[PDB]
Amino acid sequence: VKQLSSKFGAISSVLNDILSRLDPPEAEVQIDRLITGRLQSLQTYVTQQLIRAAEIRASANLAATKMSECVLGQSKRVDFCGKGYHLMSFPQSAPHGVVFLHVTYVPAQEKNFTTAPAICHDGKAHFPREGVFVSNGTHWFVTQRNFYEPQIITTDNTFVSGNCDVVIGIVNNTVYDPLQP
Amino acid sequence: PTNFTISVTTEILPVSMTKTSVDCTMYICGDSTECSNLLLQYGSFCTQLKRALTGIAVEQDKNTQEVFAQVKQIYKTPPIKYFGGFNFSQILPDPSKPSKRSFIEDLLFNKVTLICAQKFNGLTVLPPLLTDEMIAQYTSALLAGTITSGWTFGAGAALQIPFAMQMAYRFNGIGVTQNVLYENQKLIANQFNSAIGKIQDSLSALGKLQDVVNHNAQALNTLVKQLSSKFGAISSVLNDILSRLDPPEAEVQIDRLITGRLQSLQTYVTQQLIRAAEIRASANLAATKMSECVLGQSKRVDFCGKGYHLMSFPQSAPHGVVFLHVTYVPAQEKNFTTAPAICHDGKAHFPREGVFVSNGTHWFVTQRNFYEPQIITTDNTFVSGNCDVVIGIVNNTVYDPLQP
Amino acid sequence: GRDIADTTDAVRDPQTLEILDITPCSFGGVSVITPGTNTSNQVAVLYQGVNCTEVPSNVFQTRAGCLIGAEYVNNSYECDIPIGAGICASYQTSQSIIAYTMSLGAENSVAYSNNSIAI
Ligand SMILES: *[C@@H]1O[C@H](CO)[C@@H](O)[C@H](O)[C@H]1NC(C)=O
Ligand SMILES: *[C@@H]1O[C@H](CO)[C@@H](O)[C@H](O)[C@H]1NC(C)=O
Ligand SMILES: *[C@@H]1O[C@H](CO)[C@@H](O)[C@H](O)[C@H]1NC(C)=O
């Protein structure tokens, strides 16, 4: 709007002050200047609007993908649906946009433990199926990766592969067989 | 497959771009008050390009933060340097330099590379906010967190772990059991050391950052070289016009030079906007790749390398970032006879975690990515239905581990 | 005489007949660092890529030009007003404008051992 009050080398800025004061065929060298300037201004405006439309189409595609993934399911991609282990996302409508409420899982209150890669019991190594091998000073337990829950060493959560002469760092411990009779 | 080959590949993505700040009033006139007065009746043309280039520079500062500034704390590595037999000495930085960059970095900053002639016409190159030392510190903090923690330091606090079981978890994440790492740890360490030693001879590609530098230099060279154009005027220098003609008759040639240089600057601004849109797309891809490959393990195919992805390591580059994708490539295949199910005592059996194979005489269960046969047992098989519906189901004995 | 930019770089004196190189006079950008009008009214002036022995209130020579009106400290805080080349400005003592190198975070060292995990 403000570019309509420029001169662009002419003697005025409005058409009626040139078409009623200047000559009819001598105002053609200034009406052309005003036309060229306003056409250049409109072309530059359309040019920046196209680039802004592309840069907002990219964000709209990104928002559509995270509405497909975080809201309509659970995503395993790191730092895509929040910061932590993603649980949900709730959409909220916004002016010219969308707001996501990413519910995530953040752990806390860690403790240090002593760790072994495998257990040599009865001359053969033992590896956990879905757990770790931690100790708090005297005895060894199997917990999960993301939550400390010490459980009794059992055949049911360990598998045996080879002997205990190849693995390095392997410690010796007993393995309870859950069969009394 | 009966064996694997650990391979380290190299991916280069541009992140940043050379900032430029152009004084549009002095570029066109320089010292002419009459040209500065003639430029006043052109509206706000000289302010919109300045605002656009300021946005370009702020965006270029913003692009580095999403890639590199992803750590709350600057992490350090204990000086023992024994991570399960894996060699990180070429990768971790050395204290014997003022900048503390690794070799692998020092081979990269040397390759990527008219003096003061662009300064006179009004073209200034602003320095980045983060210097090379701080980007190297960010990369070293991310890399030390990756070595000492794993994926745990990207989802909260940094939890310590040995490297020889972090590698076991990343082996477990691609469908291979974790006994493979504990029984081939020295072979995998030697393969990783050879694969990371071949990177120096491989790189000594890197043409993307050189293309970015060459394009950003050629645009400024063209902008300087367009000052010699006359655009129909009798001269290309304003002092020759102003020392020869009265301003009654000198408002035509200066006007022609003004309309020439305005359209010489506007096209430069628009191409810089388009090129920085491509650079911003590359920086978004680099930030997503850092978050998904460095701070975790990705299950997407051909995103963090070529093969089954284990881990990645960032390396700083001039106006870019280099990733060292470590993958799992199988080798040494064989041929076996397979069946969908096993008929025993009139009921079909299916493997819960493996395949059914035969070498010609006996039937076994292996994994899908590694060849490890074992005895047919009720522990790794489940029963569903009878031997009437499935086609191609063969007969074999199934052993139950209960003798008394 | 002409350089690669097709402009005058050298000239010959018509009387003494010796060559004289022509160098442009010094120029740069002026950036004003302001803590806020509602907060205070004292500003700092940053010259872009200009040595401090050319400009005619503590003088600081930086890779991003000469800074006038800010005091360098030897501590490190987070960035408030980014200046360039790792230098940030702030407003503390809320009495004067200070300049410092940015701090990228804290100093943490993960206790790696051969047998140590944290759960
Ligand atoms: C590789 O490991 C060997 C043996 O530990 C040692 O020379 C050094 O740590 C590494 N050598 C390199 C990186 O050249
Ligand atoms: C120009 O700046 C440099 C800083 O690198 C320093 O030598 C001095 O401040 C200036 N040079 C001279 C000759 O005064
Ligand atoms: C782990 O054990 C190896 C045994 O070769 C030893 O060299 C290394 O120093 C140990 N690590 C630490 C942190 O002491």
Residue numbers in the entry:
A (entry chain B): 963 to 1143
B (entry chain C): 715 to 827, 849 to 939, 944 to 1143
C (entry chain B): 566 to 621, 640 to 676, 689 to 714
Please give me the paper's original passages concerning this structure.
The structure of purified XBB.1.5 S(P2) was resolved by cryogenic electron microscopy (cryo-EM). Two-dimensional (2D) classification of particles from cryo-EM data revealed a particle population that closely resembled the prefusion conformation of WT S. The structure revealed that prefusion S(P2) in a 1-RBD-up conformation accounted for the majority (70%) of the high-resolution particles, contrasting with the WT S(P2) all-RBD-down (79.6%) conformation. The diminished resolution of the RBD-up conformation, as compared to the other parts of the S structure, suggests a conformational flexibility and dynamic equilibrium between RBD ‘up’ and RBD ‘down’ states that is consistent with other reports of SARS-CoV-2 Omicron S structures. This resolved structure of XBB.1.5 S(P2), therefore, closely resembles the more open form and flexibility of the S protein of earlier Omicron sublineages. C The overall structure of Omicron XBB.1.5 S(P2) trimer modeled based on the 2.98 Å density map. The XBB.1.5 S(P2) had a melting temperature (Tm) of 63.0 ± 0.2 °C, approximately 4 °C lower than the Tm of the WT S(P2) (n = 3). XBB.1.5 S(P2) bound to the human ACE-2 peptidase domain (ACE-2-PD) with an affinity (KD 4.84 nM) that was slightly less potent than that observed for WT S(P2) (KD 1.24 nM), primarily due to the faster binding off rate of XBB.1.5 S(P2). However, several new glycosylation sites were also identified in XBB.1.5 S(P2), including N164, N536, N824, N856, N907 and N1119. However, the RBD in Omicron XBB.1.5 S(P2) conforms to a more open and flexible state that contrasts with the closed state of the ancestral strain and early Omicron lineages.
